[PDB]
């Protein structure tokens, strides 16, 4: 992932 | 009522670096 | 954006990123029009020729962002979609006429220095500002050239182009629901949107009331930044009846 991980709550 | 007046620009009477290019095009 | 420059912090606080959950990628741009409503291009969500058919749960909206890839903790806000509304006469088959969609967020977003809605024009604003030669501004995290990706939000200012000139640049049928923008070959400046910028805003600053208005949605171009071609934008004012209807109903 080029993208940084998002907090789990948003997924 | 407050749409798009930018907190870091219009709200503080600061201009971004190129908004004057837009203004100068409006005759 | 091609031949643009890095956005200043807080310069475009209505810019939204549509972010695909799986796999984690940039889907498109969009814009914040209130605390619960986000505007984008229909083809960002639905486009059968590329097998694009996104449901609510496939996507997140990321607002207040600057960096393309970093999780901007306690700056950006990430929101879930309640419902997607595509214009019922969106014409993907021919010309991307009515390339517009709305998204209602599950919860209202908190405004901040970095997060603030753009205005939608009324008839008089459109009449005043949507004139050949008048420049607007196009923002996004799309590619830096046709064939790479920016670290931070990119800006470019671009002049609206005369209707006959738009028409004569393309084989596609251009409708009254579209305008085009970009420099001509002789001009000595250039710039365009490019892959990943679709659905983002074309904005103008009213000299009458000093507010920013979203006059266009980034829709399409034949490549990016090619000499003799222009960008085609959805004309927001012309589809405002529809916008108002969706928001009034829902
Ligand atoms: C060149 C003609 C063909 C057949 O006709 C049409 C109208 C699509 C028909 O569905 C457009 N088209 C395409 O190849 C095409 C399609 C798109 O979405 C389906 C596109 O989305 C974008 N977005 C990029 C960011 C962009 C680049 C430069 C300026 C602008 Cl304003 C936007 N470019 C596209 C080009
Ligand atoms: C897109 O998906 C929805 C349900 O997910 C479906 O009802 C609709 O007909 C689909 N359109 C396509 C695949 O073109």
Q: Which residue has 């670290």 as its token pair?
A: C151
What is the DSSP code string of C119-165?
Answer: BPP-HHHHHHH--TT-EEEEEESS-SS-----SB-EEEEEEB--HHH
- Where is chain A broken, named by the residue before each break, C–N > 2.5 Å? none
Resolution in Å, one decimal, please.
2.0
Q: Whose CA is nearest to atom 25 of ligand 1?
A: C194
Ligand 2 atom at minimal distance to the Cα of residue C53: 1
Tokens encoding A11: 């997924």
C-alpha R_g of chain A: 7
Rounded Cα distance between C159 and C134, Å, is 5
Write down how long chain B is: 27
CB contact under 8 Å between A7 and C149, yes or no, is no
What amino acid positions of C are annotated as catalytic residues? 43, 99, 198
CA angle C199, B5, C197 (to 5 degrees): 15
> Domain span at residue B19?
1-27
Determine the distance separating the centroid of ligand 2 and the alpha carbon of C53, expressed in angstroms. Answer: 6
Structural domain tally of chain B?
Answer: 1
Chain B CB contacts of C134 under 8 Å are: 25-27
C32 contact partners, CB below 8 Å, separation of at least 6: C13, C14, C15, C16, C38, C63, C109, C115, C116, C117, C118
Strand blocks (E) in chain C: 5-6, 15-20, 25-32, 37-40, 46-47, 52-53, 59-63, 77-86, 101-105, 135-140, 154-159, 178-181, 201-205, 212-220, 231-235
According to DSSP, the residues that pair with C5 across neighbouring strands are C155
First vs last C-alpha separation in chain C: 34
CB contact under 8 Å between C11 and B22, yes or no, is no
The CATH class, in words, for C15-117+241-249 is mainly beta
Rounded Cα distance between C135 and C187, Å, is 14
Tokens encoding B7: 């907190």
Rounded Cα distance between A4 and C63, Å, is 15
Determine the distance separating the centroid of ligand 2 and the alpha carbon of C39, expressed in angstroms. Answer: 21
Work out whether strand C212-220 and strand C201-205 pair parallel, antiparallel, or are unpaired. antiparallel
- Closest by CA to C122, choosing from C201, C37, C203, C237, is C237
Which experimental method was this entry solved with? Answer: X-ray
First vs last C-alpha separation in chain A: 16
The region, left, alpha or beta by phi > 0 then psi within -120 to 50, assigned to residue C224 is beta
Q: Which residue has 């005043």 as its token pair?
A: C128
Strand blocks (E) in C96-246: 101-105, 135-140, 154-159, 178-181, 201-205, 212-220, 231-235
């Amino acid at each position: 992932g080029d993208f940084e991980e998002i907090p789990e709550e948003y997924l | 009522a407050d749409c798009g007046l930018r907190p870091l620009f219009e709200k503080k009477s600061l201009e971004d670096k190129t908004e004057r290019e837009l203004l100068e095009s409006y005759i | 954006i091609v031949e643009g420059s890095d956005a200043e912090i807080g310069m475009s606080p209505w810019q939204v990123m549509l972010f695909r959950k799986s796999p984690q990628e940039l889907l498109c741009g969009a814009s914040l029009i209130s605390d619960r409503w986000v505007l984008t291009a229909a083809h960002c969500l639905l486009y059968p020729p590329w097998d694009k058919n996104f449901t609510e749960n496939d996507l997140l909206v990321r607002i207040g962002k600057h960096s393309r890839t970093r999780y901007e903790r306690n700056i950006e806000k990430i929101s879930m979609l309640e419902k997607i509304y595509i214009h019922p006469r969106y014409n993907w088959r021919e010309n991307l006429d009515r390339d517009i969609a709305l998204m209602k967020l599950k919860k209202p977003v908190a405004f901040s220095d970095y997060i603030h809605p753009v205005c939608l024009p009324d008839r008089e604003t459109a009449a005043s500002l949507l004139q050949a030669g008048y420049k607007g501004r196009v923002t996004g995290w799309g590619n830096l050239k046709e064939t790479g990706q920016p670290s931070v939000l990119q800006v470019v200012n671009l002049p609206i182009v005369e209707r006959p000139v738009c028409k004569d640049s393309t084989r596609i049928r251009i409708t009254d629901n579209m305008f085009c923008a970009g420099y001509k070959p002789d001009e000595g400046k250039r710039g365009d949107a490019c892959e990943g910028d679709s659905g983002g805003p074309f904005v103008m600053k009213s000299p009458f009331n000093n507010r920013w208005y979203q006059m266009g949605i980034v829709s399409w171009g034949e490549g990016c930044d090619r000499d003799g071609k222009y960008g085609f934008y959805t004309h927001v004012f012309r589809l405002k009846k529809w916008i108002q209807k969706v928001i009034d109903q829902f």
